[PDB]
Scaffold this motif. Structure first.
Motif, short mmCIF file in Angstrom:
data_model
loop_
_atom_site.label_atom_id
_atom_site.label_comp_id
_atom_site.label_asym_id
_atom_site.label_seq_id
_atom_site.Cartn_x
_atom_site.Cartn_y
_atom_site.Cartn_z
N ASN A 150 -3.33 14.85 14.72
CA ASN A 150 -2.80 14.33 13.52
C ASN A 150 -1.84 13.16 14.37
N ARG A 151 -0.84 12.68 13.46
CA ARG A 151 0.03 11.57 13.78
C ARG A 151 1.17 11.94 14.61
N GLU A 152 1.22 13.14 15.35
CA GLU A 152 2.27 13.78 16.02
C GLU A 152 2.58 12.94 17.30
N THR A 153 3.35 12.09 16.99
CA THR A 153 3.49 10.93 18.20
C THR A 153 4.73 11.52 19.22
N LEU A 154 5.30 12.71 19.02
CA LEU A 154 6.26 13.30 19.78
C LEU A 154 5.61 14.10 20.68
N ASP A 155 4.51 13.77 21.34
CA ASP A 155 3.71 14.46 22.41
C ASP A 155 4.42 14.62 23.71
N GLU A 156 4.73 13.40 24.49
CA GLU A 156 5.71 13.52 25.32
C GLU A 156 6.57 12.08 25.71
N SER A 210 -2.36 19.12 21.64
CA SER A 210 -3.45 18.54 21.29
C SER A 210 -3.28 17.00 20.93
N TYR A 211 -4.02 16.12 21.08
CA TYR A 211 -3.72 14.65 21.40
C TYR A 211 -4.80 13.90 20.55
N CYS A 212 -4.32 13.03 19.58
CA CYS A 212 -5.04 12.32 18.93
C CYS A 212 -5.14 11.01 19.01
N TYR A 262 -6.17 22.70 13.30
CA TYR A 262 -5.96 21.23 12.56
C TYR A 262 -4.63 21.04 12.23
N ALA A 314 -2.82 19.57 15.28
CA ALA A 314 -3.17 18.25 15.46
C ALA A 314 -2.25 17.05 14.46
N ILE A 315 -1.55 17.69 13.67
CA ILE A 315 -0.76 16.93 12.90
C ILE A 315 0.29 16.35 13.47
N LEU A 316 0.68 16.85 14.58
CA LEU A 316 1.67 16.22 15.59
C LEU A 316 0.42 16.01 16.63
N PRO A 317 0.15 14.68 17.09
CA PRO A 317 -0.75 14.40 18.30
C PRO A 317 -0.15 14.49 19.23
N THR A 318 1.14 14.43 19.60
CA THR A 318 2.00 14.62 20.80
C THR A 318 1.33 13.87 22.18
N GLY A 319 0.82 12.81 21.99
CA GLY A 319 -0.08 12.21 23.06
C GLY A 319 -0.94 10.94 23.02
#
Lengths: 47, 49, 41
Positions: free
Chosen positions: A1-7, B10-12, C4, C7-12
């Motif tokens: 998903n849109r979780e752009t707080l990965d690192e 997990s990374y999208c 799933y 993966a709503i936070l992709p964090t990468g």
């Protein structure tokens, strides 16, 4: 998903090391050879 | 003893958009709109030279 | 990816953008999905 707080939090402290960079066309590519560094003088083979 | 199993991050991907005018090809095109195509049925240019 | 809601936070960085699963299929789990599938919900 849109979780752009990965690192991406703090960008911690950097220092300066002896590093050898080359310019392979476009890319800035690191390059180091390491036998005397960490494979030296043991009974472990080099890969 | 304890025994857990883990989902370790997990990374999208982030799929990119492309404006075609934001691309070097569109100097060969003339991006002009026409909101009433489906009734136009024909067209021509009579080209005096 | 399997969970799933994780993966709503992709964090990468989804970063390579190459043809997935035409490569080595080395993944323990992967699902080549079209626009929707009921198991997503």
């Amino acid at each position: 998903n849109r979780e752009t707080l990965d690192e991406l939090e703090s960008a911690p402290q950097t220092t300066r090391v002896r590093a050898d960079l080359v310019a392979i066309g476009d890319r800035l590519v690191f390059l180091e050879a390491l036998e005397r560094r960490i494979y030296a003088a043991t009974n472990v083979p080099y890969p | 003893d304890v025994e857990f199993d883990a989902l370790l991050g997990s990374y999208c991907n982030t799929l990119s958009l492309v404006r075609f005018l934001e691309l070097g090809l569109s100097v060969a095109c003339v991006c002009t709109k026409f909101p009433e195509l489906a009734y136009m049925n024909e067209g021509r240019v009579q080209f005096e030279v | 990816g399997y969970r799933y809601a994780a993966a709503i936070l992709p964090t990468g960085s989804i970063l390579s953008t190459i043809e997935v699963a035409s490569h080595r299929r080395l993944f323990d789990f992967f699902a080549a999905v079209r626009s929707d599938e009921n198991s997503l919900y």
